[PDB]
Amino acid sequence: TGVTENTICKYGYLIQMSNHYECKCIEGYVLINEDTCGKKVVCDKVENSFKACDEYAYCFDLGNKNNEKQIKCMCRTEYTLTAGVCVPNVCRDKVCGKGKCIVDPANSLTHTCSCNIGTILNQNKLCDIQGDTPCSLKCAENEVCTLEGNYYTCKED
């Protein structure tokens, strides 16, 4: 199973889309897993290899028959680039319309689309249908569900 209403996001907070929950990271952090974030690290040392450097990305160093550092921010294993951002392999060059491609929690072998609020998912797994999903987050004390762009999130009053 992926992110649910009771999922705890390490160094991140819960957001709600039309048909799924997701974890979004605190300032200065990026996603390692669906529910885990780590500090965004600058890839400028071999000592920093495999540290978080972007969403689903970690620092990677190449020894191209060299002694110099050849380091870049690379998609973690089981992830690949799509539209300039690392995505799950099941999301390789997949489109969602008004939504975000994710791993399908009901079947890890396929992808699905987490649709922006105001759009629901069509039977072809495209976010191109107009529907309004109510907010189902459990917000903390002195907090209220707030629509921030494409996703609901709990915000302070």
From TrEMBL:
<feature type="disulfide bond">
    <location>
        <begin position="139"/>
        <end position="154"/>
    </location>
</feature>
<dbReference type="GO" id="GO:0016020">
    <property type="term" value="C:membrane"/>
</dbReference>
<feature type="disulfide bond">
    <location>
        <begin position="96"/>
        <end position="113"/>
    </location>
</feature>
<dbReference type="GO" id="GO:0009986">
    <property type="term" value="C:cell surface"/>
</dbReference>
<feature type="disulfide bond">
    <location>
        <begin position="53"/>
        <end position="73"/>
    </location>
</feature>
<keyword id="KW-0732">Signal</keyword>
<feature type="disulfide bond">
    <location>
        <begin position="135"/>
        <end position="145"/>
    </location>
</feature>
<feature type="disulfide bond">
    <location>
        <begin position="43"/>
        <end position="59"/>
    </location>
</feature>
<feature type="domain" description="EGF-like">
    <location>
        <begin position="90"/>
        <end position="128"/>
    </location>
</feature>
<feature type="domain" description="EGF-like">
    <location>
        <begin position="42"/>
        <end position="87"/>
    </location>
</feature>
<feature type="disulfide bond">
    <location>
        <begin position="115"/>
        <end position="127"/>
    </location>
</feature>
<feature type="domain" description="EGF-like">
    <location>
        <begin position="3"/>
        <end position="38"/>
    </location>
</feature>
<protein>
    <submittedName>
        <fullName>Ookinete surface protein Pfs28</fullName>
    </submittedName>
</protein>
<feature type="disulfide bond">
    <location>
        <begin position="75"/>
        <end position="86"/>
    </location>
</feature>
<feature type="disulfide bond">
    <location>
        <begin position="25"/>
        <end position="37"/>
    </location>
</feature>
<feature type="disulfide bond">
    <location>
        <begin position="91"/>
        <end position="101"/>
    </location>
</feature>
<feature type="disulfide bond">
    <location>
        <begin position="9"/>
        <end position="23"/>
    </location>
</feature>
